[PDB]
């Protein structure tokens, strides 16, 4: 299972039958490459990674020559170097001259690795023309210049293997290979926008970023994703006030190379309609005002209404930070009561799995172990519509291994061959007792993934007690070294919200609200409003909620702060700010501390570290980062998630509706971008065939 090979004095042992480039990169030897990639299948196309191997007449392609035991491998024979110059010359004398106006100026990997391996006189005459290539439209989200495509075929392999939209095929021979389609139809798939970070030349590129920047002006900054519960691995390109674009950084457990395609275009959703100043309504006449004026107006209105007991319904918004939610819960409990629910359509009730025993709550299997699962089934969700990179790992496993996959509930087209078994709870219990009671018990480490959309419904009862009772009642695999019972969330911060323990408590839920803390709660805001509203909308990008507001608080978004976030697997991941907040726009937990000053019940903590100290005092899984093992309550948690909500709700046969209609317009950032409006109207006959 290990083999020594010698690359130029560097002996190194790697696994048998592996890739020679993997040996070179383990040996710390830089080998130039264009059509190799890590998480794609190997093609021999780019012909650059040539290396000299003993007992071989030709320098073989190190991307695909498998590891033979005990090889002598030279990357520095003059045949190798003075053939690499040869191959780079014969890659460049049909490339166009777009280098000043090609988007990847300091990132054309061809251009980057040209000077140290290349050759000056690309031989030409005015008589000679190279060739031209027809530009092609792949979608209004991706700008495309196919003149530059060096036919690395990384795009094709990505659209086939990982994306599952095979609509980007190759075409033609000779000079006349074009990539895309000659039906001229737009790609409208999930995670399409990974491909512009993937084509190593600037043939594919970003449409709203198109020419705005060029990568040495850019304070490239580590941060954590939003608009998905997975807490993806982003990195923000910043010009200093504006945010230019995002790049998915590498993080091998959680979504190793990819971004959710909604998360790629928060930049056009950021700098467009932010709340820069507090706004107050005279009434249908909505004027901005001084900060202290608005604070004193809020405190004076609180003293006017005096909502002392079991009132002032704060509600967890979609996209916030843990520290603001800690300030929210602590300020409400300091003020006198507890009424904090979430955005969900009538989730003014417990999520039918207790805040006790953390393992019951989140996606407690590892994201990598998804490709270690024998056969899984999904209920109440469309994982293409939510957490698209989770769908990417699903397809990665489904092409790798043999998995029996079934959807139950919503009718979904996902690219890994589900077997839908009804739109009803009775169909669910039938399918569990019928044949997956054989499969999941017979299989080795199965998983069972549930949507958040079922927790929205009043059918969080018998529908959810059925699957919990099945988890207990099939205890043979799902107890000790594996935990299949898992849910996903729509938003990221709802995971940390249920971690801190926002309570929907029925002693307080059966009352009417008279003060409302909206934190971006665009979804629930049409219903939950009284006449005596006094809606305090804190946040940014006032799409919905500011339109229902009484006082606007211009909160800073995720980009401008060190928002410690929780994924849907319980990992704490801490951010960094990449720009200051625009305008007045102070930071959110500081806003709630100042409200605690004016609405005169002050918090016991005000500096930066004190927030983290109280957060450690609340749940110390959130101060130790990105490493979770909840092995201790794998068995008692399903008892305490089953017996509680048992039979309080008769199983309603209302069908399992689609959780998200428009994926592209969500979350009060992606809700409000002219990128996502264009991609949302990319549904038409152009996409269909």
């Amino acid at each position: 299972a290990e083999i020594e090979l010698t690359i130029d004095g560097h002996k190194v042992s790697i696994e048998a039958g592996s890739a020679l480039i993997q040996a070179c990169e383990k040996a710390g030897v830089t080998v130039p490459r264009y059509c190799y990639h890590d998480k794609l299948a190997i093609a021999g196309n780019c012909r650059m990674c040539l290396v000299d191997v003993e007992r071989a007449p030709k320098p073989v392609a190190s991307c695909a020559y498998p590891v033979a035991p005990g090889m002598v491998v030279r990357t520095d024979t003059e045949r190798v170097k003075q053939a690499r110059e040869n191959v780079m010359e014969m890659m460049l004398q049909n490339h166009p001259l777009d280098c000043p106006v090609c988007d990847q100026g300091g990132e054309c990997d061809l251009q980057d690795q040209s000077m140290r391996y290349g050759r000056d006189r690309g031989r030409f005459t005015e008589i000679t023309g190279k060739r031209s290539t027809e530009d092609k439209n792949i979608g209004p989200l991706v700008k495309t210049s196919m003149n530059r495509c060096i036919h690395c075929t990384r795009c094709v392999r990505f659209a086939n293997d990982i994306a599952g939209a095979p609509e980007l095929g190759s075409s033609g021979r000779g000079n006349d290979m074009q990539i895309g389609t000659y039906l001229e139809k737009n790609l409208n798939t999930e995670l399409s926008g990974n491909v512009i970070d993937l084509c190593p030349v600037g043939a594919l590129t970003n449409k709203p970023y198109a020419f705005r920047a060029r990568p040495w002006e850019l304070k490239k900054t580590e941060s954590i994703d939003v608009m998905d519960a997975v807490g993806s691995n982003i990195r923000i390109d910043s010009k200093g006030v504006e945010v230019m674009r995002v790049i998915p950084r590498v993080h091998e457990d959680v979504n190793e190379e990819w971004i959710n395609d909604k998360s790629r275009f928060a930049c056009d959703g950021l700098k467009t309609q932010r709340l820069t100043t507090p706004l107050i309504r005279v009434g249908d006449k909505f004027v901005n005002a001084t900060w202290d004026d608005a604070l004193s107006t809020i405190a004076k209105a609180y003293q006017q209404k005096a909502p002392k007991g079991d009132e002032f319904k704060a509600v967890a918004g979609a996209l916030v930070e843990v520290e603001s939610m800690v300030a929210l819960k602590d300020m409400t409990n300091a003020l006198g009561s507890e009424n904090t629910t979430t955005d969900t359509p009538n989730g003014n009730s417990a999520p039918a799995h207790g805040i006790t025993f953390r393992s019951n709550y989140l996606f407690n299997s590892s994201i990598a172990g998804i490709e270690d699962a024998d056969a899984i089934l999904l209920v109440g969700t469309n994982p293409r519509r939510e957490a698209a990179v989770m769908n990417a790992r699903i397809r990665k496993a489904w092409l790798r291994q043999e998995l029996e996959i079934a959807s139950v509930g919503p009718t979904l087209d996902a690219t890994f061959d589900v077997a839908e078994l009804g739109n009803t709870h009775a169909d669910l219990e039938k399918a569990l007792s019928g044949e997956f009671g054989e499969v999941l018990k017979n299989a080795k480490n199965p998983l069972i993934i549930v949507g958040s959309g079922i927790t929205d419904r009043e059918d969080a009862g018998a529908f959810f007690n059925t699957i919990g009772k099945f988890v207990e009642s099939t205890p043979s695999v799902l107890n000790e070294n594996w935990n299949g019972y898992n849910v996903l969330q729509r938003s990221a911060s709802r995971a940390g919200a249920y971690d801190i323990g926002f309570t929907p408590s029925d002693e307080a839920s059966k009352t009417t609200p008279k003060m409302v803390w909206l934190l971006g709660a665009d979804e629930v805001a049409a219903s939950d409003i009284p006449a005596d509203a006094f809606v305090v909308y804190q946040g940014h990008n006032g799409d919905v909620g500011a339109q229902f507001a009484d006082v606007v608080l211009p909160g800073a978004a995720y980009t401008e702060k060190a928002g410690t976030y929780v994924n849907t697997e319980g990992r704490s991941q801490i951010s960094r700010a990449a720009t200051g907040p625009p305008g007045g726009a102070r930071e959110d937990w500081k806003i709630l501390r100042a409200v605690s000053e004016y609405l005169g019940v002050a918090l016991p903590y005000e500096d930066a570290y004190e927030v983290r100290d109280r957060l450690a005092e609340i749940s110390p899984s959130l101060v130790r980062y990105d490493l979770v093992e909840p092995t201790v309550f794998g068995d008692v948690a399903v008892q305490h998630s089953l017996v509680g909500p048992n039979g309080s709700v008769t199983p309603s046969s209302a069908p399992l509706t689609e959780t998200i209609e428009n994926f592209y317009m969500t979350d009060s950032i992606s809700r409000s971008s002219p990128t996502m409006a264009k991609s949302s109207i990319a549904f038409n006959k152009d996409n269909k065939k």
């Binding site: 830089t30 000077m115 140290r116």
Partner: protein
């Protein structure tokens, strides 16, 4: 230290290592061309010296603390402004807030070279 021969037309270099904490002795006891240069070394670094007369500042402002060629504090400096209107002619500093920050160069290619070594032995 770079030294120069006269009879032999031959340079040499001589290195020590010193910490901001602990000094290393000067070489002004041997000749007189030192006591200006070691002032320059002290001013640019805070590499403190020893056995030396007149270890002043030359290369900065006279009330200016910090040491510039340490890679601790950047190009702007901490307090570098000057203005004189109200407290008259007292050209007193502030927090140095520039008018456009030195937008850096943070690009880097694959790898420069591997050296073709040569030694006599």
């Amino acid at each position: 230290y770079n030294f120069l021969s006269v009879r032999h037309n031959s340079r040499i270099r001589l290195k020590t290592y010193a910490t901001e904490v602990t000094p290393v002795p000067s070489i002004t006891c041997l000749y007189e061309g030192a006591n200006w240069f070691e002032r320059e070394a002290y001013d640019m670094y805070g590499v403190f010296f020893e056995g030396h007369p007149d270890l002043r500042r030359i290369m900065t402002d006279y009330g200016f603390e910090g040491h510039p060629l340490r890679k601790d504090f950047p190009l702007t400096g901490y307090t570098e402004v000057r203005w004189d209107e109200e407290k008259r002619r007292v050209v007193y500093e502030p927090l140095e807030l520039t008018q456009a920050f030195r937008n850096f160069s943070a690009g880097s290619t694959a790898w420069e070279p591997v050296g073709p070594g040569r030694d006599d032995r």
